[PDB]
Amino acid sequence: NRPEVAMHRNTVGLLPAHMWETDKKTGKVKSVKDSVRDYQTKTPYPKWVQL
């Protein structure tokens, strides 16, 4: 949710915390793990498309 209307409705469940690497002391994000290699999706295109 953008700041305007619903902002307080955001949840920590939207956070992909498993994607990055964090500093224990600062509670801040130092590095990012690699996205593309291990990425598995049954749906590159939407389900309803058959090429």
């Binding site: 130092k30 590095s31 990012v32 793990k33 690699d34 996205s35 593309v36």
Partner: protein, 161 residues
């Protein structure tokens, strides 16, 4: 992906400097200035900050004053009356050859900041405690006003015989 251990060209470039001063061109120092008030002189800070009296405030004033009348409180009335009596005394006529100093010509160009600076400092120098042309003190006789609480109408029962 996979954030690098080093950045070759990123942190390599010359860092931008933190500005030394503020205001115009980031060159102006932090110091005491003309706009500074003094809280040590008189009831009103000097030079006086802008003040806005709103009709809203007037109606609040009215309800306060009424409610004060009805509770038989003569105190704040008497404070106010004293203040008025002290500062409203008619300013004396100044003697020939007494005028407020102007800024002398041919010092700076006409467009220059010196002018205002001089005005501001001269007035900052004369606080209302320094106004000797208005007669405030225990010495002064005040023909137009009542002297103390006894003489005001809410004391009227003492005035009867």
């Amino acid at each position: 992906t996979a954030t690098p251990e080093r950045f070759s060209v990123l942190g390599t470039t010359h860092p931008k400097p933190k500005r030394t001063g503020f205001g115009r061109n980031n060159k102006m120092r932090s110091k005491p200035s003309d706009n500074v008030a003094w809280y040590d002189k008189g009831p009103v800070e000097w030079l006086p900050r802008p003040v806005r009296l709103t009709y809203d405030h007037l109606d609040q004033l009215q309800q306060w004053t009424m409610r004060a009348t009805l509770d038989g409180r003569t105190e704040e009335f008497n404070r106010i009356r004293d203040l008025h009596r002290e500062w409203s005394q008619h300013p004396l006529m100044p003697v020939l050859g007494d005028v407020e100093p102007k800024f002398p010509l041919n010092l700076f160009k006409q467009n220059h900041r010196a002018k205002k600076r001089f005005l501001v400092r001269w007035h900052k120098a004369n606080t209302p405690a320094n106004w000797l042309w208005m007669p405030r003190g225990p010495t002064v006789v005040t023909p137009l006003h009542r002297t103390n609480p006894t003489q005001y109408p809410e004391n009227w029962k003492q005035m009867v015989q």
